[PDB]
Ligand binder design. Structure first.
Ligand SMILES: C[N+](C)(C)CCOP(=O)(O)O
Ligand SMILES: C[N+](C)(C)CCOP(=O)(O)O
Ligand SMILES: C[N+](C)(C)CCOP(=O)(O)O
Ligand SMILES: C[N+](C)(C)CCOP(=O)(O)O
Ligand SMILES: [Ba+2]
Ligand SMILES: [K+]
Ligand SMILES: [K+]
Ligand SMILES: [K+]
Lengths: 287, 287, 287, 287
């Protein structure tokens, strides 16, 4: 009955805190876009600090640079690794040429890699799928059915898309303490070969259903939450995409009916009106 | 009976109009090939307009450029970010060198990214699958079976390919108004481990079938359309591909039989003749 | 009984001849490695022929090049699009600089794309799966079972790998002429979460089997062939791979038993001996 | 009863030794990170050794290089293929210019490819999934159930993840010698639409189970091992990942119960405590 703390947030993210360079690839792609341009911008500097430090490690090898001045070796270093090569700051002798070839080799390895991640980070698209703000439990074809709906926000379609409704709630074990059980709920249409507009997902509540007989109260008490797992291959990106959302007992409108989002234009051509997406019809009795 | 407006077009595209920078990645890959070369061509210009604007923000730092002339700073700017570095327009002092390194850093970030999308846009292949112009309903192994066929237009094969026949038609709810129902039709062979030539898809019409007993009329009236969803992994691209098509009541040849597309060459070696692909045998009674 | 022409070759390729720039992406990746280096090597030349043709379209704009000589404009053109920029052949005036920026823009678009395909073509790996030279039909757990085996030639493993045995043979329709039927044969283990060594695929021949009761003769006569479709995700490439093979009636050793390929090393550690891979035990009666 | 040699190691790797340039792509991605930077660093050198050898193959074509000195042609060669182009070492005549364009063409093909692999090798991520050190067999909902658990070590989640428990043990054929049988064990939850924290996998031991009635002894004797095959699409990388592990008879704690890894923080917010991950509760009788 009483209000409780959310285990999952509306965006299907968790409120559990785990407890714990050693995971660079993940780290690299994982970091905020500024921190990345920072790391890279950094590495770049350090290598030219190293090479500048190399051409000085040997005598005054480059021409037109002042002796022992690291500055000159460093700006040369950028000009040799970025393949600009103006022609003022220039090498001298066999040794300087060898180092330059090496820095050019790296500068080329530098980009090839800076570009790999630059792209990996890039090729992680959203589905632009919209989830309904509530869900309803309402009789459908004479059976109390729990339902929620989602819509594709993009012109381009999503193919072989599918979704999961997963109840989560505390339940006493046959023996021992209480644990939240992961109940994957059976749907009338789990898969959808194509999805461009709107989809009402629904789980009929029959004798086998975890929420069979469950009321608001018993639900509240079981501390039950629901989680939508949507996934599918976006036609637009030619690639996979996903999306999560979470609902709570407060959200479920009982006897709710989603409202038809399909509208006729003045022109008379039909259309989809995402304004009704969250509208839920409800019947009100007297007093 | 009467003619009606198409909900889907032959190319399986929709005639619904939704209603609604905020979606850059999608936008970027989404845009027409000219608009892209335009955006990029543009950004390029703006940055060199910015850098040219930087070397001028400080005194006359570059050598061989006229003072205060933005022009010189800008063409220098392209030569410094594209790593040409002729050696006429050249930096001076510590500050100019630092900016040059920064522009070189960007010019390298610029390409790495311009190349990501250049490739993403590129790696979205067609299946080169051809759909039959009509479909038929014809008895097959003593059961009225709805069928349509598709063929692979490329030498290279498509693997683990599969298709969906999805009837779409207006149907009165158990209560409330009319809605088009998404009937996914059961096929005799949904999957095909490999597909290189021709495939007749078919949905037997038995007691469970949505179109069981349905006639042209009742079909027309139910405003029914059919949609082919083909997908599969092209051997050629080593990658996934798909294709849609739509059919209408007018298209279905009742009692139609697709005509064998397999032909013997003069040499005697057998072959596939895509000329008969759309040919449908029909029996004509008297008068 | 009599020998016949193969519809599929040992490498699971077809002997049907279809009948039929318009398909560039496919074409590009499709072509032989020389033809590719050729197309590219070509395009490169044509553009610099175009740009060289541009700097000449206007007066003598570049310095150190002879007037009206296309040669000079062309080698300059490579040096401006490849971002070498020695500093002999150099622009003059606002117009030359503008074209140079444009060629640099293209030269950078040129690589980004030349690299996309350079990579796409590259990232199409073989599975290095080996197929047995014959197949056998032999009693297994008291049931005549058709079987064939394949092995992974690479240290690295293949995961969620699966295979299809697909009989192909001419069969008279319930009405009309003869057509080859695609019989996908039911296996005892279609999927395999992991595969690194050897796998005997097998299709038990029971009452439901297409080849139930079929003999060599009836098989020969039905002109039956079998096709192995293997697919799976190679751990090595972190990517998908596949492989086909075809067998004929001549190949099937009846009463054949594949011979155990697992061998103990002198060291005593166990090992896999791909020498027995194609060895088939057969029992020989008298006379 | 007696101790035996492990067929699989804890990391799910094999102890079988197979028996056997011809497989470059695999080889390339396969090799240790040093050996790679080596091969490349090498190829680079050889080509410039070739080009340097070309400009010398013809007369003294480049300006500012000493005649017949390969050294000069080689360092020039790096400066022409890396597109630095200082402007000291410079071409002369039509022939030198043509070769330079060719080397620039290659130097650009060189990077495009060096970058393909540089990235392919890069985009092969770990799942950072942790496996429990033992497994248990313990009654669960009144049925002896074999179980093991794994946890996601990364903030980011893994989606549509699934696992396989695969018993492996020597078993006498209906006829002939002994072979290890690949028993894929049926689980209560094979698939999991999402996985971020902890997952107890479990195989109920009923009449159909390979290990039905099996004891430590009979297991030991059957030389049975178990192999966990985990796979799933990491949300972090936007890509697929996998992980193997192996267990032995010694590892299985009979009557074991994994210990709840979920802990409440001082703040009161809940959390996951990977310290209990390997903790197994066991009941101890008297004496
Ligand atoms: C809603 N659906 C999943 C059953 C049908 C497909 O969605 P849509 O065709 O309206 O875009
Ligand atoms: C038509 N099919 C899907 C059943 C068989 C495979 O197609 P194909 O082998 O003719 O290219
Ligand atoms: C043969 N198999 C497919 C059943 C088992 C897995 O193959 P392997 O473990 O011997 O490499
Ligand atoms: C354990 N599970 C697989 C059933 C549920 C999902 O895992 P998780 O939600 O705890 O990260
Ligand atoms: Ba350059
Ligand atoms: K220069
Ligand atoms: K110069
Ligand atoms: K230069």
């Amino acid at each position: 009955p009483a209000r409780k703390p959310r285990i999952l947030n509306s965006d299907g993210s968790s409120n559990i805190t785990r407890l714990g360079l050693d995971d660079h690839y993940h780290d690299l792609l994982t970091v905020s876009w500024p921190v990345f341009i920072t790391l890279i911008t950094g590495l770049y500097l350090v290598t030219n600090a190293l090479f500048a430090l190399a051409y000085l490690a040997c005598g005054d090898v480059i021409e037109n640079a002042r002796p022992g001045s690291f500055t000159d070796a460093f700006f040369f270093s950028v000009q040799t690794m970025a393949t600009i090569g103006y022609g003022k700051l220039i090498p001298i002798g066999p040794l300087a040429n060898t180092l330059v070839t090496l820095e050019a080799l790296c500068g080329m390895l530098g980009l090839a890699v800076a570009a790999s991640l630059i792209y990996a980070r890039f090729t992680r698209p959203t589905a632009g799928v919209l989830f309904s703000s509530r869900m309803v439990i309402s009789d459908f074809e004479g059976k109390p059915t729990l339902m929620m709906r989602l819509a594709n926000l993009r012109i381009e379609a999503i193919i072989e898309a599918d979704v999961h409704l997963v109840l989560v709630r505390s339940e006493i074990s046959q023996e021992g303490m209480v644990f939240r059980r992961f109940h994957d709920l059976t749907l009338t249409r789990s898969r959808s070969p194509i999805f461009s507009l709107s989809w009402t997902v629904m789980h009929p509540i029959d004798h086998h259903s975890p929420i069979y007989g469950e009321t608001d109260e018993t639900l509240r008490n079981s501390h039950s939450e629901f989680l939508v797992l949507f996934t599918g291959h976006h036609e637009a990106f030619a690639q996979n995409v996903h999306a999560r959302h979470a609902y709570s007992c407060d959200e479920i409108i009982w006897g709710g009916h989603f409202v038809d989002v399909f509208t006729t234009l003045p022109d008379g051509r039909r259309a989809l009106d995402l304004g009704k997406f969250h509208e839920i019809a409800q019947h009100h009795h007297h007093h």
